[model samples]
Target: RALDRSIVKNLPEQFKNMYKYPSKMDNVLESWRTGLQSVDDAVMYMKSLGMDFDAISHFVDAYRKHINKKGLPYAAA
Candidate 1:
């Protein structure tokens, strides 16, 4: 799902800091809980504003294309 992908890709820095790699010891559960909760909250907010998954996904796709073409500093809107 786009929401899941976005949640992972754009994880909050604070939550990300809870995890460490290679050592195989970190707050993995806490990170996942925070990330999933954020995703759920965002999805609910969007839906409350009458936006559906398909609409959001299409917007995400278009946003990605715009960014690829113009770079982050360029504002498409």
Candidate 2:
């Protein structure tokens, strides 16, 4: 188990491994979801993980809006 790491699902699979250790609040994904971390920072981390630009941009735009509108990273359980 981990924190609400639902945001990871939107990112590339390369980043899925990042959530295993700490599994708690304040991770890049969580911070980004909560509006604490900037989009650039989170996208930067994801960038380091996978090295893709267009995919990240497309997914982040949709995910960013979802997190803002819903206050949660995921739609359902």
Candidate 3:
């Protein structure tokens, strides 16, 4: 619905409602990590819900770009 202007305004409310469901972040994240086929499956699931893949890909690119632009200093194990 985020891609659809008619529904985009309600996205934050919908997301907040999802937070009321009976599950913790760790549980949901762990389940996705265990059963998810790949990152593409996750993207397709969002696409099925009416989000634009091109817009979503921009978000992915931005995160990587941010990490590269601001390097974190860490040592290898």
The alpha-carbon lDDT assigned to residue 70 of candidate 2 equals 53
lDDT of 3: 0.42
Which sections of candidate 1 miss by over 4 Å? 1-48, 74-77
lDDT of 2 by residue, 1-77 (tens): 22244555654553445434334322544666765545666677667777445556654664566457656634344
TM-scores of all predicted structures = 0.32, 0.41, 0.36
Task: Please report the TM-score between candidate 3 and the true structure.
Answer: 0.36
Predicted candidate 3 versus true structure: per-residue lDDT over 14-58, tens digit per residue:
333333442542344334345532445545655666655454453
- Give the Cα error of residue 36 in candidate 1, in Å: 24
Q: lDDT of all predictions, in order shown?
A: 0.40, 0.53, 0.42
Q: Which digits, one per residue and each the tens of the lDDT, describe model 1 over residues 1-77?
A: 23444543443443223222312212432332334434344346445656545544543453344345444442244
In TM-score terms, candidate 2 sits at 0.41
- The Cα error of candidate 1 at residue 35, in Å, is 24
lDDT value for model 1: 0.40
When 1 and 2 are scored with TM-score, the better candidate is 2
